[PDB]
């Protein structure tokens, strides 16, 4: 900043703070899986 604004930002940082707490491939996979087919 280069002004008296930089010192408060700085101070604020040191202070601390929390932080909020945190299709083709499936078709393919399904195919390999297998399947039964109604008998005729």
């Amino acid at each position: 900043a280069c002004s008296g604004n930089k010192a408060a930002l700085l101070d604020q940082i040191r202070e601390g703070a929390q932080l909020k707490k945190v299709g083709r491939d499936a078709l393919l996979d399904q195919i390999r899986q297998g399947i039964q087919l109604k008998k005729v």
Binding site: D29, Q30, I31, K39, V40
Partner: protein, 359 residues
């Protein structure tokens, strides 16, 4: 079965059709349409050849590619109305196409299915891929050989590789021809009236592939080990020997019908060589065979032998010959269409009405 999906695989010689979820085609009929030779207005299938005598017969599918769109329509009509006994407009319909099918064809087909048959939803899938699916794989190289054409299709993660596809205009229709030829060259009067039919049955009943052609010839020359017999209906019995394995040999040596092309082992090897060096391992170990012309006893092991000889000594080879491979393609489709992760892949009439055939 209503509001269920339809599967329709149109071969050069045979149409296979049925319902998704079923383990097999409910309908298998000749892919031919006959119109009155002189002047009802059209026949299709078994009935068309039953009356071949008063009609001009035609084959909409040549080389696995649709060439006659009018006749192809009559086939699809006969499929829905006369075989499956269903109404197209209440069944999503999956259809199959040849490798290397021109885009204008695919669109022409999508365009008919929607405008003329008014099916709610549709999908076009490449025949070889379905075969692969049927085997439970999404990576490998298929050898599809039906009545009209033969392809080698390399596939990686559900997608075919067009740069690496090998086409071979040699299939069962010409093998039956070859056999008919030889048979006759030995005093067996054969024509088309009904003979052509017998020659085909002899083919599927008696022909097989030699593991070693040169070696197999010598066997049938020194003993009757390999003779087999076939009684015609007329009554006249006939005996076959080396003809049982010389006929299928044409697949490995096309120079038997005078084609200066290369055999299916070579095209299989060439097809793989045409692929990324890192996926060859997967391909060599996943040769899936489909089509009715792959049904010959001994073809699996001949292929295994031939390929082991063409490839690196270190590579593990593997041939998969499903006993149901005559219908692999159709089965492959039957499976796909029924899967739930697939239900979003359908082309809806709505989607088509907005974008166009190019969707």
């Amino acid at each position: 079965d209503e509001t269920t999906a339809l599967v329709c695989d149109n071969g050069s010689g045979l149409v296979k059709a049925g319902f998704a979820g079923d383990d097999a085609p409910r309908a298998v009929f000749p892919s031919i349409v006959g119109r009155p030779r002189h002047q009802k207005d059209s026949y299709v299938g078994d009935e068309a050849q039953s009356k071949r005598g008063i009609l001009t017969l035609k084959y909409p599918i040549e080389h696995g590619i649709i060439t006659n769109w009018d006749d192809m329509e009559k086939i699809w009509h006969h499929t829905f109305y006369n075989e499956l006994r269903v109404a197209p407009e209440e069944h999503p319909t999956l259809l199959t196409e040849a490798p290397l099918n021109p885009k204008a064809n695919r669109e022409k087909m999508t365009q008919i299915m929607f405008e003329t048959f008014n099916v709610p939803a549709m999908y076009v899938a490449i025949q070889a891929v379905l075969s692969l699916y049927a085997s439970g794989r999404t990576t490998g190289i298929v050898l599809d050989s039906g009545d009209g054409v033969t392809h080698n299709v390399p596939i990686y993660e559900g997608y075919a590789l067009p740069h690496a596809i090998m086409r071979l205009d040699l299939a069962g229709r010409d093998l039956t021809d070859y056999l008919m030829k030889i048979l006759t060259e030995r005093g067996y009067s054969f024509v088309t009236t009904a003979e052509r039919e017998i020659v085909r049955d002899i083919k599927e009943k008696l022909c097989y592939v030699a593991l070693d052609f040169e070696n197999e010839m010598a066997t049938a020359a020194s003993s009757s080990s390999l003779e087999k017999s076939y009684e015609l209906p007329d009554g006249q019995v006939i005996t076959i020997g080396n003809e049982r394995f010389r006929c299928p040999e044409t697949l490995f040596q096309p120079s038997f019908i005078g084609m200066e092309s290369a055999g299916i082992h070579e095209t299989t090897y060439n097809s793989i060589m045409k692929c990324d060096i890192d996926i060859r391992k997967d391909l060599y170990a996943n040769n899936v065979m489909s089509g009715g012309t792959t049904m010959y006893p001994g073809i699996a092991d001949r292929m295994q032998k031939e390929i082991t000889a063409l490839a690196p000594s270190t590579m593990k080879i593997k041939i998969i010959a499903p006993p149901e491979r005559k219908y692999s393609v159709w089965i492959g489709g039957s499976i796909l269409a029924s899967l739930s992760t697939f239900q979003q892949m359908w082309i809806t009439k709505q989607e088509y009405d907005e974008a166009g055939p190019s969707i």
